[PDB]
């Protein structure tokens, strides 16, 4: 009804600064609550740095729902948005 098909998605293909900040915060909070970790944890123990490692390797299992001013929205998985 308000979801947009993956073909006519006309928002930016790039992760914005706010989306990146909130995604990292949410992933860090999740990992600090003994959530499973998708990357191989080698040296670092801080949940924020682990979340950054996951973000770089496109392994954060989250979805951004971008609301338009008319109420409709587009859904983008974190692994398909482009990270600078």
């Amino acid at each position: 009804e308000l979801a947009i098909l993956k073909e006519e998605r006309t928002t930016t293909p790039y992760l914005t600064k706010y989306e990146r900040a909130r995604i990292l915060g949410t992933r860090a909070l999740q990992i600090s609550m003994n959530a499973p970790v998708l990357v191989d944890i080698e040296g670092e123990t801080d949940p924020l740095q682990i979340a950054m490692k996951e973000l770089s390797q496109r392994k954060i299992p989250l979805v951004i729902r971008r609301y338009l001013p008319d109420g409709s929205y587009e859904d983008w998985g974190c692994d398909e948005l482009i990270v600078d």
Binding site: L68, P69, D70, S72
Partner: protein, 213 residues
């Protein structure tokens, strides 16, 4: 002397009225466009030199392009009145004549003032449309000013396209007053959308859209 100045100002106002009509889409003969001050004085003035404002009143028909585009474009009547103050009498005659020959739009150019009692007949004369301008206002064509970019009224289909492209409602657009000098000059009715292309120092060119209230 001052007679020359009065005649020149009246001729400038007449040229502005013709430019207004042609801009709005009506066909005007190219020779009546280039009407010169002396030739105008020949065709209008008297032996005493004072001008008959009853000969300037002309009739304009829609150019075929402005008919294919603005399907709601009827036939235009333009009258320069002789009474400086205009009352309910003169408006009654004007409205009777406009409805009498099914003229869609009647422009009533006056000199001094149009009284509110007369002013009340302007909206009550459906389905015809009566607009008024003051001669002092028409001396300069303001659409030629450098700060006034070119306004182009959209058609119904293009207005719908504009609203759907932005997923917009009519009330969520920038707005223009019906009494705006460029809306007044263009004969904008409520709900019609002009497109305003203008200079942009950051991007070169920028298109703006306003809905007339």
């Amino acid at each position: 002397e001052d007679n020359n100045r009065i005649i020149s100002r009246l001729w400038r106002s007449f040229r502005t009225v013709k430019e207004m009509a042609a801009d709005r889409g009506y066909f005007i003969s190219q020779e009546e466009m280039d009407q010169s001050l002396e030739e105008f004085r020949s065709k209008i003035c008297d032996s005493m030199g004072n001008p008959q404002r009853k000969l300037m009143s002309f009739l304009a028909n829609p150019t075929p392009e402005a008919l294919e585009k603005y399907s709601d474009l009827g036939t235009l009547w333009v009258e320069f009145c002789d009474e400086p103050s205009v009352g309910i009498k003169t408006m009654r005659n004007f409205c009777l004549r406009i409805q009498e020959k099914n003229f869609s739009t009647g422009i009533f150019i006056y000199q001094n003032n149009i009284t509110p009692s007369a002013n009340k007949m302007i909206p009550t004369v459906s389905p015809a449309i009566i607009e008024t301008f003051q001669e002092s206002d028409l001396v300069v064509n303001i659409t030629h000013h450098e700060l006034v970019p070119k306004h182009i009224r959209l058609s119904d289909g293009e207005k719908s396209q504009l609203l759907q492209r932005y997923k917009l409602k009519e009330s969520q657009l920038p707005r223009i007053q019906r009494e705006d000098p460029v809306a007044r000059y263009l004969g904008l009715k409520r709900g019609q959308v002009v497109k305003i292309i203008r200079r942009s120092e950051t991007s070169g060119r920028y298109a703006s859209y306003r809905i007339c209230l």
